[PDB]
Design a protein around this ligand. Structure first.
Ligand SMILES: Nc1nc2c(ncn2[C@@H]2O[C@H](COP(=O)(O)OP(=O)(O)O)[C@@H](O)[C@H]2O)c(=O)[nH]1
Ligand code: ALF
Ligand SMILES: [Cl-]
Ligand SMILES: [K+]
Ligand SMILES: [Mg+2]
Length: 250
């Protein structure tokens, strides 16, 4: 069955969207941290789509066990579509997570939620330009006004029937080298995600993959060589490339 996962920052409106899509009445609150575990439901208008409400998350290197629930569901390879719920009033901050979601290889559809909040403040956001620069479908949504909901579910449903944010080519060289070291050690769909996290020296991914000493020695050498090329630490190279990619689109 087609699985759509609701991924987004805390308090961005994920459960609000879930309740409209499923007809459920899961807990919704005007403060972050209401949802703490996964909740499933059928799309009321297409009973062939199953959608998953998940706790808020800021980064695929999560800062909390609740957020790690959302990361673990994505990396369990059970989701066919990521419905990325983006707080339209906090575009830049939300898009940092969005870049990592795209790298997972699971097709991403953006629900630009709380668009009524932006409307009241007289602010505009060209969805077509944002979609063009991110490489994913984008739909302005409002769970309060109940606008755009059915539309974003259809496009998420159809991404399941991929262009990654391409960073500095010096970093892309290292990513390709780490990919060839990984081989089939990771699911092919999410190979780029694991390669980047390994470059970031992410502790979660390192503990999860359990690579051989032969693999780890080369990855370390790739990181060190690339760090010398950038004259910057590995973790900061990726963070700077994510934000630099965002500013070109925002
Ligand atoms: N104005 C406006 N408020 C919203 C929208 N979506 C959600 N909210 C409000 O934001 C708060 C948090 O929503 P919630 O569903 O709990 O977000 P979640 O934490 O990601 O699940 C609730 O008080 C909602 O009423 C929207 O599109 N527009
Ligand atoms: F902050 Al929440 F579900 F309560 F993402
Ligand atoms: Cl987080
Ligand atoms: K909330
Ligand atoms: Mg919630």
């Amino acid at each position: 069955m087609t699985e759509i996962a609701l991924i987004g920052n805390p308090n961005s409106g994920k459960t609000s969207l879930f309740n409209l899509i499923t007809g459920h009445n899961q807990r919704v609150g005007n403060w972050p941290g209401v949802t703490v575990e996964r909740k499933s439901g059928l799309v009321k208008k297409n009973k062939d789509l199953e959608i998953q409400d998940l706790p808020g998350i800021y980064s695929m290197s999560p800062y909390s066990p609740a957020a790690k629930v959302a990361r673990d569901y994505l990396l369990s390879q059970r989701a066919d579509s990521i419905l990325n719920v983006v707080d339209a009033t906090n575009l830049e901050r939300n898009l940092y997570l969005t870049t990592q979601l795209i790298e997972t290889g699971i097709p991403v559809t953006i629900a630009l939620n709380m668009i009524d909040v932006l409307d009241g403040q007289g602010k505009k956001i060209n969805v077509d330009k944002l979609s063009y620069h991110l490489g994913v479908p984008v739909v302005a949504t409002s769970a309060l006004k109940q606008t755009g909901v059915d539309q974003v579910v259809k496009k998420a449903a159809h991404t399941t029937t991929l262009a990654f944010p391409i960073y500095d080519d010096r970093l892309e060289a290292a990513i390709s080298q780490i990919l060839e070291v990984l081989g089939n050690s990771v699911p092919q769909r999410s190979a780029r995600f694991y390669a980047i996290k390994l470059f970031e020296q992410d502790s979660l991914v390192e503990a999860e993959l359990d690579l051989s000493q032969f693999q780890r020695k080369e990855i370390e050498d790739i990181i060190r060589i690339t760090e010398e090329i950038f004259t910057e630490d590995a973790e900061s190279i990726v963070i700077n490339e994510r934000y630099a990619f965002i500013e070109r689109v925002c």
